Amino acid sequence: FKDKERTTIAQQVKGKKVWIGIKKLLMLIEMSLQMDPEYRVRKFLALLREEGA
Amino acid sequence: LVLLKKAPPQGRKLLIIGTTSRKDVLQEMEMLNAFSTTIHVPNIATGEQLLEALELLGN
């Protein structure tokens, strides 16, 4: 994830509480990755919306 | 389910597909988390999809 995307996530995470694990996180970044660049982060986050809640 | 969480020797790669008509008892037996993702398949909800399917079949 390039720095721009790091920030792009980072704005709206800290207001939120995370319950996650690593071995899931790998698959998350992966399956989100295979979309085109704009979509990538949107998909990662949107999965986390339901997953981490 | 160990096989769902098992890896073959490195470099090799697979996908394993499953089916069922229920998720509820499987969540009860805690095999669902092993599955990386899910798909709800919906069921035919609309006469629209019905009648266009019948346009397709043409019977």
UniProtKB/Swiss-Prot annotation, chain A:
It is found in: Cytoplasm. Belongs to the AAA ATPase family. Homohexamer. Interacts with GABARAP and GABARAPL2. Interacts with GRIA2. Interacts with PLK2, leading to disrupt the interaction with GRIA2. Interacts with MUSK; may regulate MUSK endocytosis and activity. Interacts with CDK16. Required for vesicle-mediated transport. Catalyzes the fusion of transport vesicles within the Golgi cisternae. Is also required for transport from the endoplasmic reticulum to the Golgi stack. Seems to function as a fusion protein required for the delivery of cargo proteins to all compartments of the Golgi stack independent of vesicle origin. Interaction with AMPAR subunit GRIA2 leads to influence GRIA2 membrane cycling. This is Vesicle-fusing ATPase. It comes from Cricetulus griseus. The lineage of its organism: Eukaryota, Metazoa, Chordata, Craniata, Vertebrata.
